[PDB]
Design a protein around this motif. Structure first.
Motif, PDB file in Angstrom:
ATOM      1  N   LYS A   1       0.830  -1.205   0.000  1.00 44.93           N
ATOM      2  CA  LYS A   1       0.000   0.000   0.000  1.00 44.93           C
ATOM      3  C   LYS A   1       0.863   1.254   0.000  1.00 44.93           C
ATOM      4  CE  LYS A   1      -3.703   0.772   1.766  1.00 44.93           C
ATOM      5  NZ  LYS A   1      -5.004   1.065   2.432  1.00 44.93           N
ATOM      6  N   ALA A   2       1.851   1.300   0.897  1.00 42.98           N
ATOM      7  CA  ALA A   2       2.751   2.448   0.966  1.00 42.98           C
ATOM      8  C   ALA A   2       3.586   2.578  -0.302  1.00 42.98           C
ATOM      9  CB  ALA A   2       3.653   2.333   2.194  1.00 42.98           C
ATOM     10  N   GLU A   3       4.067   1.450  -0.836  1.00 48.24           N
ATOM     11  CA  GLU A   3       4.900   1.477  -2.036  1.00 48.24           C
ATOM     12  C   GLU A   3       4.125   1.979  -3.251  1.00 48.24           C
ATOM     13  OE1 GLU A   3       8.280   0.638  -1.636  1.00 48.24           O
ATOM     14  OE2 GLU A   3       8.274   1.780  -3.511  1.00 48.24           O
ATOM     15  N   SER A   4       2.860   1.577  -3.385  1.00 49.86           N
ATOM     16  CA  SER A   4       2.048   2.048  -4.501  1.00 49.86           C
ATOM     17  C   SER A   4       1.561   3.479  -4.301  1.00 49.86           C
ATOM     18  CB  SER A   4       0.864   1.108  -4.712  1.00 49.86           C
ATOM     19  OG  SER A   4       0.040   1.083  -3.564  1.00 49.86           O
ATOM     20  N   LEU A   5       1.293   3.887  -3.056  1.00 50.39           N
ATOM     21  CA  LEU A   5       0.902   5.268  -2.803  1.00 50.39           C
ATOM     22  C   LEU A   5       2.069   6.234  -2.956  1.00 50.39           C
ATOM     23  CD1 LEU A   5      -1.561   4.859   0.196  1.00 50.39           C
ATOM     24  CD2 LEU A   5      -2.089   5.885  -2.025  1.00 50.39           C
ATOM     25  N   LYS A   6       3.307   5.748  -2.831  1.00 55.17           N
ATOM     26  CA  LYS A   6       4.466   6.585  -3.118  1.00 55.17           C
ATOM     27  C   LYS A   6       4.551   6.976  -4.587  1.00 55.17           C
ATOM     28  CE  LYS A   6       8.554   5.613  -1.539  1.00 55.17           C
ATOM     29  NZ  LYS A   6       9.747   4.836  -1.101  1.00 55.17           N
ATOM     30  N   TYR A   7       4.043   6.138  -5.491  1.00 55.37           N
ATOM     31  CA  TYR A   7       4.089   6.422  -6.918  1.00 55.37           C
ATOM     32  C   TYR A   7       2.771   6.932  -7.478  1.00 55.37           C
ATOM     33  CZ  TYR A   7       8.699   4.314  -7.172  1.00 55.37           C
ATOM     34  OH  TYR A   7      10.036   4.037  -7.008  1.00 55.37           O
ATOM     35  N   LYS A   8       1.655   6.706  -6.792  1.00 53.24           N
ATOM     36  CA  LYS A   8       0.400   7.345  -7.166  1.00 53.24           C
ATOM     37  C   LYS A   8       0.425   8.798  -6.712  1.00 53.24           C
ATOM     38  CE  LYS A   8      -3.707   5.478  -6.326  1.00 53.24           C
ATOM     39  NZ  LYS A   8      -4.450   5.612  -7.609  1.00 53.24           N
ATOM     40  N   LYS A   9       0.131   9.718  -7.626  1.00 62.77           N
ATOM     41  CA  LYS A   9       0.064  11.138  -7.312  1.00 62.77           C
ATOM     42  C   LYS A   9      -1.386  11.599  -7.411  1.00 62.77           C
ATOM     43  CE  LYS A   9      -0.257  13.150 -11.677  1.00 62.77           C
ATOM     44  NZ  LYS A   9      -1.141  14.254 -12.122  1.00 62.77           N
ATOM     45  N   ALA A  10      -1.806  12.409  -6.443  1.00 62.42           N
ATOM     46  CA  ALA A  10      -3.215  12.634  -6.162  1.00 62.42           C
ATOM     47  C   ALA A  10      -3.856  13.571  -7.183  1.00 62.42           C
ATOM     48  CB  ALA A  10      -3.391  13.195  -4.752  1.00 62.42           C
ATOM     49  N   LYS A  11      -5.187  13.575  -7.173  1.00 63.38           N
ATOM     50  CA  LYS A  11      -5.960  14.449  -8.041  1.00 63.38           C
ATOM     51  C   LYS A  11      -5.916  15.884  -7.531  1.00 63.38           C
ATOM     52  CE  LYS A  11      -9.983  13.382 -10.923  1.00 63.38           C
ATOM     53  NZ  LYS A  11      -9.137  12.576 -11.846  1.00 63.38           N
TER      54      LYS A  11
END
Lengths: 266, 129, 169, 286, 65, 188
Positions: free
Chosen positions: D257-267
RNA sequence: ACGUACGACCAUACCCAGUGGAAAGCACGGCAUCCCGUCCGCUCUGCCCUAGUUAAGCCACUGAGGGCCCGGUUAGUAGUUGGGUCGGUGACGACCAGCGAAUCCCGGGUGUUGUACGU
RNA sequence: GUCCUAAGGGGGGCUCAUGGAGAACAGAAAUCUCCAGUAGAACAAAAGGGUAAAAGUCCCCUUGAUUUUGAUUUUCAGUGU
C-alpha cells in the motif's frame, strides 16, 4: 408473421392455458430520486431473469392517464410494472402496476423511507445467486382483512413479484434465502421488507436449527394511492384454466394402478 | 465406504476384437488389464483413460488375464494352448511361454502370496483337455 | 521516445488488384496472372451494385485481388518500383501512411509474354504499420491504436526515401 | 458534413463496460448462467478457462447478483511446486492445471455445527453425487486441439462431472468419427513438444537452442517429459494444496500500500483547479 | 402382435388389420431384451411380414432394424 | 436450541410458492433503536423460516436422484390474477360449418401426406411443393401441344407456365376465401 | 493502494489530445513440426516466456470542446379536474382544494464496487 | 419467361449504409486499401426504448416434406387394431 422467428414471437405472446413466467418492466418518470433508483436497482437484482429495464425519462402519471403504460405493456409483453417517481408531496414513490390483457388491472403506491433504506451492497454477506427463487414469509395482522384493502393488494403484488418460476420439484439446496414482509393492522402503518440468507445448524434431532443473516435490501413502505380493479375484469383474471393433463372425473369410471379403465356396478 | 458408480469415466478403444476378460491390479485402480480375441492383452492407465502397454505373442483368443497377488506379474491364458507371464511395469514377456496343455487353456489361478515357497510363484491353469 | 525499436515502420501487406469489369475468360486470365505473380490462389470480387453504363450486374464477379505479406510483398513492391523507375508522386501517398500505384503492363515485371493470356495491368497498394498492430486486429480485448503510434504521410514519404532511395514529385 | 456533433453524442448509447473492453460475451453468458433444463432451484457452477501469454487461469465460479464468486482457483505457474518449470502454457500444463483445480475443489468439499439440508433430508437409498460444472471458454475458439479442452479433460480426470463430447480432443478424426487415444496420451504427457524438440535438434540447431534455451539450461531432455508430467500428476493427486513461493519481491499488504501510494500522485483539488484557471485567464489576458 | 401399421395394398385393409405379405406390423419385443441408449426398455418395434399367411397358416416377420 | 415455534395462532402454508403466512401480530417495539428493531425483525423472520423449513422437510415427499435431494411440491393454492384471457375456440369458418352440417370427417394424417407413388417412373414423388406433381411436365424436354390450344394461346405466353398459372389462380381463390373468413371472424 | 481473471451497476465509465507508470502482472513479441484455419500463420490455432520494449494496448493525471450524471430554483407555478364555494339575472370576478409540469437560472462532478490470486 | 441438394433449425466467423484520404485503364457512378462511422444499412414490424462478437450477412451439419406413445382435453365415429 411471414418470418418463422416472428411467428415464434407471436406464438410466445399468444394466450395460453398455462401462462408463461411473469415479466416485469422497471421504468422511471421525468423526475426520480437517486434513492428510488437504488430501490429499483435492488428489486431488479432480485428479479433479473424476468425483467426488462427502461433508461429514459417518461412523462407518465399513472393515476391521471395510463395509456402510455398500456402501450408499453403491449409493446414489450411486460405485465408487471415498477414505476419510479419523485415529487415535493411524495419524495420517494414506487408505483406497482399490474396488467391484464394489456390494460391496467390494478395499481398501488409505495412510499420509501429515505432514512432507513439500505441497499444490497450495504450488507457484507453472501448474496443470492442469479435466477434462484427465494421463499416468502408474510407476517402481521394487516394481511387478514375481511375486505380487500391496500395491504391485501400489496401482499398480492409482492407474492406475484417474488413468485419466480413455478415447479413441481425443488432441490433442498434451494432453500437458503427468504423474503419477509411485516405489516400490522393499525397513523399509517409501516410495511417492512427484509431479505435473509439462511444458515442451518445441528440441534440433536431430525429437524435442523435455522439461523438468519441479513442480505438486503432494507425497505420501509407506507401504502398510498390505490387503483382497484373492475369486478368483471377481476373475475375474468381470476378464472382458472384446466390443464389437459387434469382429467375430468366420470361417474363409476376410474383408473387402477396398472392403468386399466375400471367400471363400477351396484 | 464405497460409493455407487453412476457415470462413464472413460470409453477407451484399441482392441480390434471383443473383450473377453478384464481385471484391475491389486495395488490400485490405476492399472487395468484386459484380454481380447485379437490375440492380445492390454494394460490401461485408468487415471487419464489411456493405453499403457500392448502385450502380443498369443495366436489364439486371450481367454483370461490374472494379476499376481503382489501385483508384479500378469498371466494370460489363451486358446493357442499356452499361458504367458508378463511384467506389467514394462510390458515385456518374462521367460518363454508355458507349453504342455493339449487344448484351450480356459482358467488361471495364482497361488496365494503367503504360500509361496522355494523363491518362486506357482500358477494353476485349467484347460479343455 | 521516437528512437524506440517498436516504432519502426514496416510493410503490413501488399494488395494486388485487377478490375477487368467483365466476367469469364478475361477475369480467369487476370486471376491466372495474379496466381503466377504471387504464388497463391486469388480472390474473385463481385460487383456490389448494378450500373448499366459500365455493363455490370449485382453478384457478378468483376474483379480479382491477392493479399501478400512478408518478404514476398517487399519483393513484389521492389519489382513494381523497378518498373516505375523509383519515382512516385505526392498525390499517390495517403494521409493514413499507406500508398500505392498502378501499372498497365505486367510482362515488364519479368513474366514471359504468353499469347493465350495477353496484356493486363494492375494496382499495387502497400499498407504500413508499426509493431503493435495486433491490438486493433485480435479478437479478444480489441482496442484502438493510439494517436502517437499512427503513421503520417510525411513519415511514410521519409521512410520510402530512406529505404527504396526513390524520388517523390 | 461533421457527424460527431452534439446530437450524435447525446443520442449515443454506450455498450457494457466489459463489452467495450472486449472481455465478456454477454450473449453467451446469459445462456450460460440464466438457462437451465430443470427448475429445481439448484446452484450452478462453471469452470472458467482463460489464457495469458505466460499463464493459464482456471477458476470455479458461481454467479450472484452483486458479482461472481470464486469457489476455487488454480494457475499454471503453481506447477513449479509440482516440478513443471517450463512450458507453462502448453496443452499438458493445461491438463495439469485442470487436474489441480479438480483436486482442490474435491479437497475443499471434503470429497477426496454447520451442515447442509442435503445431509438433513438424506434418505436411506441415497448415494454421493459428483460435483458438476459447465465449461466457460470465453472468447476462445473451440477448435480441435485447443487447450480449453485440455483443462476440461484434466478436470474431468480429476473428478469433476463436466458434460462434454470427445470430438474436440487432439487425435480425433472427423472422417471416421474416432479418437486416436495414442495421440491423446502423447499430448497429455507432452510428446508433441518432445517430438518438436527432436525434430529441431535433427534439422535446425540454432532455432532449437533459441526456442528451448531454458530446457537446455535446466537440463530437461525431451525423453523425460512423460515421466516428469506423470510425477507431476501423482504429486498433484497426493497434495493438491502444496504451498509455493515465487522469486518476486515479498512485502506485506500495507507495505505494498505504501509502495504504490508513493508512486500514485493525487488528483487536483478545487482550489488548485481554480488557481490554474485564474493563471490561464491571466496568461490569456497578457 | 401389437397392431397392424400399414398394409401396402389398401388403407381399408390396414384398418381391418389384414396380415399379408409386405405388411408392416407392430410387435412386442420384450423377450428380445432391447435397451435404448438412455437406458429405457424398448418393448414395441416394427416388423415386416415376409410370407403369405393365407397360404402358410403362420405369420413370419423380420424386424426393421 | 429448539426447532419448534409456538404461536397463539398457527401458521398457514402454500408450499407451491414456498409461502408461509403468519397471522400472529408482530409486536414491533415503540423505540428508535434500530439494533433492537432488527433483532425483533430477525427473530420473527427466524421463526417463519424455521417453521417453513420444518413444513417442507416433514410434509413433502423426498426423492434422492442424481440431480440431488428433491422435495415434491403441491400445486399452488393462493389465488393470483392471470394476464391473458383463457383462450376460446375460434369462430367457426364457412368450411367448418359446412362440414359439420354435412358430416364430413377430417382427413387422417396418413391420408393427407405430401407423398404419392408414381407408377410410370416407379418412384415416390410429392403431390405439391418443390418438384410437386402439380407441376409435372414443366421441365421435361418434350411437351406435345394442341393446334387449337396454340391458336387460342396469347402471344408471348408459353406452354411451360400453364400449370403455374393454374396454381396461382387456385392460390388466389384460397386467400380470397381465407381473407373473407378472417374478416367475418373479426366482425364476430 | 497497484495488477490479473471473472463480474455488478452499465457514459460520473463515452468522443479528442498530451504527460507519466517502481514492483510484479497484463501486453506488444519470437517460431510455424504437431492440433487447427485462412487468398495471405492478417485473424484463429499450436510451440517458446528466452531476447528486446513500455512505442502502442492497459492504468493514473491533466486539458479544451461536446455529452452525461446529481441537488436547489422554477413552483405547488403554468395547465387539468373537483365545479367545494361567496356574491352575481346566470355567466362572470374572486377565494378552497386534489393532481401536478417544462423552459430558463444557480451549484457540484467526470466513476464506485464484489470474489479469488498475487505485487 | 428463366433459376434452385426446398424452406426451417442449431453452431461458428464477420460488421453494415455513408463520409474523408489513396490506387493503370477507372472518368460523379465498376474494384481494392486505410480511417471515422449507435446503426442513419439490412431483416421484421408499424415504439413513445426491435436487433451489432446479432434477430443482419456468409460458412459447417441436417434436410427425414410433417415421427411415436397416452388409460388425459375437445369433437366425431353402422369401417369402434
Amino acid at each position: 408473421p411471414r418470418n418463422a422467428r416472428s411467428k415464434r414471437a407471436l406464438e410466445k405472446r399468444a394466450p395460453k392455458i398455462v401462462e408463461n413466467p411473469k415479466t416485469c418492466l422497471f421504468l422511471r418518470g421525468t423526475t426520480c430520486s437517486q434513492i428510488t433508483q437504488d430501490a429499483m436497482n435492488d428489486l431488479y437484482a432480485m428479479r433479473q431473469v424476468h425483467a426488462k429495464r427502461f433508461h429514459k425519462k417518461n412523462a407518465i402519471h399513472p393515476f391521471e392517464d395510463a395509456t402510455s403504460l398500456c402501450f408499453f405493456s403491449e409493446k414489450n409483453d411486460c405485465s408487471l410494472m415498477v414505476f419510479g417517481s419523485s415529487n415535493k408531496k411524495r419524495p420517494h414513490t414506487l408505483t406497482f402496476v399490474r396488467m391484464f390483457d394489456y390494460k391496467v388491472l390494478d395499481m398501488l403506491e409505495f412510499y420509501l423511507d429515505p432514512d432507513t433504506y439500505r441497499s444490497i451492497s450495504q450488507f457484507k454477506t453472501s448474496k443470492i445467486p442469479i435466477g434462484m427463487r427465494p421463499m416468502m414469509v408474510f407476517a402481521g395482522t394487516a394481511f387478514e382483512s375481511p375486505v380487500p384493502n391496500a395491504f391485501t393488494m400489496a401482499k398480492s403484488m409482492l407474492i406475484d413479484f417474488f413468485r419466480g418460476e413455478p415447479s413441481d420439484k425443488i432441490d433442498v439446496e434451494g432453500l437458503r434465502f427468504v423474503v419477509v414482509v411485516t405489516a400490522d393492522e393499525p397513523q399509517k402503518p409501516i410495511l417492512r421488507l427484509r431479505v435473509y440468507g439462511i444458515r442451518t445448524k445441528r440441534s440433536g434431532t431430525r429437524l435442523p436449527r435455522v439461523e438468519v443473516e441479513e442480505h438486503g435490501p432494507r425497505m420501509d413502505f407506507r401504502l398510498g394511492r390505490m387503483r382497484e380493479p373492475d369486478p368483471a375484469m377481476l373475475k375474468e383474471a381470476m378464472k382458472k384454466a384446466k390443464t389437459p393433463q387434469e382429467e375430468r372425473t366420470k361417474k363409476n369410471i376410474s383408473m387402477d394402478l396398472l392403468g386399466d379403465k375400471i367400471g363400477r356396478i351396484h | 465406504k464405497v460409493h455407487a458408480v453412476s457415470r462413464l469415466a472413460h470409453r477407451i478403444p484399441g482392441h480390434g476384437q471383443p473383450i473377453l476378460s478384464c481385471q484391475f491390479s491389486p495395488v490400485s485402480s490405476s492399472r487395468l488389464a484386459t484380454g481380447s480375441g485379437d490375440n492380445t492383452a492390454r494394460i490401461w492407465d485408468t487415471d487419464s483413460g489411456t493405453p499403457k502397454f500392448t502385450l502380443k505373442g498369443h495366436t489364439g483368443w486371450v481367454l483370461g488375464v490374472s494379476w499376481s497377488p503382489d501385483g508384479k506379474y500378469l498371466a494370460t491364458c489363451s486358446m493357442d494352448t499356452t499361458v504367458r507371464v508378463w511384467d506389467p511395469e514394462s510390458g515385456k514377456q518374462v521367460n518363454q511361454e508355458f507349453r504342455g496343455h493339449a487344448k484351450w487353456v480356459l482358467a488361471l489361478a495364482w497361488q496365494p502370496y503367503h504360500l509361496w515357497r522355494d523363491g518362486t510363484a506357482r500358477l494353476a491353469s485349467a484347460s479343455k483337455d | 521516445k521516437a528512437q524506440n525499436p517498436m516504432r519502426e515502420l514496416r510493410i503490413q501487406k501488399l494488395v494486388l488488384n485487377i478490375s477487368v469489369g467483365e466476367s469469364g475468360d478475361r477475369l480467369t486470365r487476370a486471376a491466372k496472372v495474379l496466381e503466377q505473380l504471387s504464388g497463391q490462389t486469388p480472390v474473385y470480387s463481385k460487383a456490389r451494385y448494378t450500373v448499366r453504363q459500365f455493363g455490370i450486374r449485382r453478384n457478378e464477379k468483376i474483379a480479382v485481388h491477392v493479399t501478400v505479406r512478408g518478404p514476398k510483398a517487399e519483393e513484389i513492391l521492389e519489382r513494381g518500383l523497378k518498373v516505375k523507375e523509383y519515382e512516385l508522386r505526392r498525390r499517390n501517398f495517403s494521409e493514413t501512411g499507406n500508398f500505392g500505384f498502378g501499372i498497365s503492363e505486367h510482362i515488364d515485371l519479368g513474366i514471359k509474354y504468353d499469347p493465350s493470356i495477353g496484356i493486363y495491368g494492375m494496382d499495387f497498394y502497400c499498407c504500413m504499420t508499426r509493431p503493435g498492430e495486433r491490438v486493433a486486429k485480435r479478437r479478444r480485448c480489441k482496442s484502438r491504436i493510439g494517436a502517437s503510434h499512427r503513421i503520417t504521410r510525411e513519415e511514410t514519404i521519409r521512410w520510402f526515401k530512406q529505404r527504396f532511395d526513390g524520388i517523390v514529385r | 458534413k461533421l457527424v460527431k456533433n452534439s446530437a450524435y453524442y447525446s443520442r449515443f448509447q454506450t455498450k457494457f463496460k466489459r463489452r467495450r473492453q472486449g472481455k465478456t460475451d454477454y450473449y453467451a453468458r446469459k445462456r450460460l448462467i440464466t438457462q437451465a433444463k430443470n427448475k429445481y432451484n439448484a446452484p450452478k457452477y462453471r469452470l472458467v478457462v482463460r489464457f495469458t501469454n505466460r499463464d493459464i487461469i482456471t477458476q470455479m465460479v458461481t454467479s450472484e447478483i452483486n458479482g461472481d464468486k470464486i469457489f476455487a482457483a488454480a494457475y499454471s505457474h503453481e506447477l513449479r511446486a509440482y516440478g513443471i518449470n517450463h512450458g507453462l502454457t502448453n496443452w499438458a500444463a493445461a491438463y495439469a492445471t485442470g487436474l489441480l483445480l479438480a483436486r482442490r475443489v474435491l479437497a475443499k468439499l471434503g470429497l477426496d455445527g454447520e451442515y447442509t439440508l442435503t445431509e438433513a433430508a438424506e434418505t436411506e437409498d441415497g448415494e454421493r453425487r459428483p460435483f458438476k460444472a459447465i465449461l466457460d471458454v470465453g472468447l476462445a475458439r473451440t477448435s480441435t486441439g485447443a487447450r480449453v479442452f485440455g483443462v476440461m479433460k484434466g478436470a474431468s480426470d480429476g473428478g469433476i462431472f463436466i458434460p462434454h463430447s470427445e470430438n474436440r480432443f487432439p487425435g480425433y478424426d472427423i472422417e471416421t468419427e474416432e479418437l486416436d487415444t495414442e495421440v491423446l496420451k502423447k499430448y497429455i504427457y507432452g510428446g508433441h513438444v518432445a517430438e518438436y524438440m527432436e525434430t529441431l535438434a535433427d534439422d535446425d540447431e540454432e532455432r532449437y537452442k533459441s526456442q528451448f534455451v531454458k530446457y537446455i539450461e535446466d537440463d530437461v531432455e525431451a525423453d523425460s517429459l512423460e515421466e516428469l508430467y506423470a510425477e507431476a500428476h501423482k504429486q498433484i493427486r497426493a497434495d493438491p494444496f502444496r504451498k509455493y513461493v515465487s522469486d518476486a519481491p515479498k512485502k506485506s499488504k500495507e507495505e505494498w500500500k505504501a509502495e504504490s501510494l508513493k508512486y500514485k500522485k493525487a488528483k487536483l483539488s478545487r482550489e488548485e483547479r481554480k488557481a490554474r484557471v485564474e493563471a490561464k485567464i491571466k496568461q490569456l489576458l497578457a | 402382435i401389437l397392431s397392424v401399421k400399414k398394409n401396402p395394398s389398401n388403407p381399408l385393409y390396414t384398418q381391418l388389420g389384414v396380415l399379408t405379405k409386405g405388411t408392416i406390423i407392430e410387435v412386442n419385443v420384450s423377450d428380445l431384451g432391447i435397451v435404448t441408449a438412455s437406458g429405457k426398455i424398448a418393448w414395441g418395434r416394427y416388423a415386416q411380414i415376409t410370407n403369405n399367411p393365407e397360404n402358410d397358416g403362420c405369420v413370419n416377420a423380420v424386424l426393421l432394424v | 436450541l429448539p426447532v419448534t415455534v409456538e404461536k397463539p395462532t398457527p401458521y398457514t402454508f402454500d408450499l407451491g410458492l414456498l409461502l408461509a403466512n403468519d397471522p400472529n401480530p408482530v409486536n414491533v417495539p415503540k423505540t428508535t433503536d434500530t439494533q433492537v428493531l432488527e433483532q425483533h425483525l430477525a427473530s420473527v423472520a427466524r421463526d417463519g423460516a424455521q417453521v417453513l423449513i420444518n413444513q417442507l422437510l416433514t410434509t413433502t415427499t423426498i426423492t434422492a436422484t442424481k440431480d440431488g435431494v428433491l422435495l415434491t411440491l403441491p400445486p399452488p393454492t393462493t389465488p393470483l390474477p392471470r394476464e391473458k384471457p383463457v383462450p376460446q375456440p375460434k369462430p367457426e369458418t364457412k368450411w367448418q360449418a359446412f362440414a359439420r352440417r354435412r358430416g364430413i370427417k377430417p382427413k387422417t394424417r396418413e391420408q393427407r401426406r405430401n407423398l404419392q407413388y408414381n407408377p410410370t417412373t416407379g418412384q415416390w414423388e410429392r403431390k405439391w411443393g418443390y418438384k410437386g406433381a402439380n407441376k409435372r411436365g414443366e421441365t421435361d424436354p418434350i411437351i406435345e401441344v394442341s393446334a387449337a390450344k396454340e391458336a387460342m394461346r396469347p402471344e408471348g405466353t408459353s406452354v411451360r407456365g400453364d400449370k403455374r398459372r393454374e396454381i396461382r389462380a387456385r392460390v388466389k381463390k384460397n386467400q380470397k376465401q381465407m381473407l373473407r373468413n378472417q374478416r367475418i371472424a373479426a366482425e364476430k
